[PDB]
Structure 1
């Protein structure tokens, strides 16, 4: 028997909280596969664990670019641009200006917790939901 006509609506930013959907992470095989899959992608391309961020709101978070693995992770921040269309001719303002061949660290500052910063909140929501 067909369930009554259903709409799924997915909440955007602002609702984010420490510990969000880590109840499901304990219990659900399907949820575990979503976080674990994404936390391995983050750990290896950008040098942080999105789980750690969600579980314990860290105020500061330093990435280090040491060893061969670490140099690969630094190229992944250096490649991230912002091909803006500002002026008649497009101008490319490279995100993370403080990251060059001779960096060994980059630190994400927040006031309250990193889970309230746009770039961590956006994934933590989008996972919690997808899970």
Structure 2
């Protein structure tokens, strides 16, 4: 809850079709930076190809949304 803005108990308790995080107030913004620092590094021939895991989350994003047709 306090670092990614979701409840793993909820997800487990009632399988949600979708789930949006909201980067609300001062705490909302704290959360989204933790999303923004998700890095996927890729050492390719000496070179370190790093990318944001969450492409879209940026300084102007108001929310992100996880999706799944099943749950």
TM-score range for the pair, normalised by the shorter chain length: over 0.9
Please state which structure has a larger fraction of its residues in strand.
2
Greater CA radius of gyration, 1 or 2? 1
Decide which structure has greater helix share. Answer: 1
Larger relative contact order (CA 8 Å, sep ≥ 6): 2
- Give the TM-score taking structure 2 as reference length: 0.95
Q: For each residue in 1:4-34, what CA deviation from the matched residue of structure 2 results, as whole angstroms up to 9, or x when unmatched?
A: xxxxxxxxxxxxxxxxxxxxxxxxxxxxxxx
Paired residues in the alignment total 71
TM-score of the superposed pair, with normalisation by structure 1:
0.52
Runs of 4+ that moved beyond 4 A: none
CA RMSD of aligned residues (A): 0.9
Unpaired segments ≥5 residues, structure 2: none
Gaps of at least 5 residues in structure 1 are 1-42, 114-131
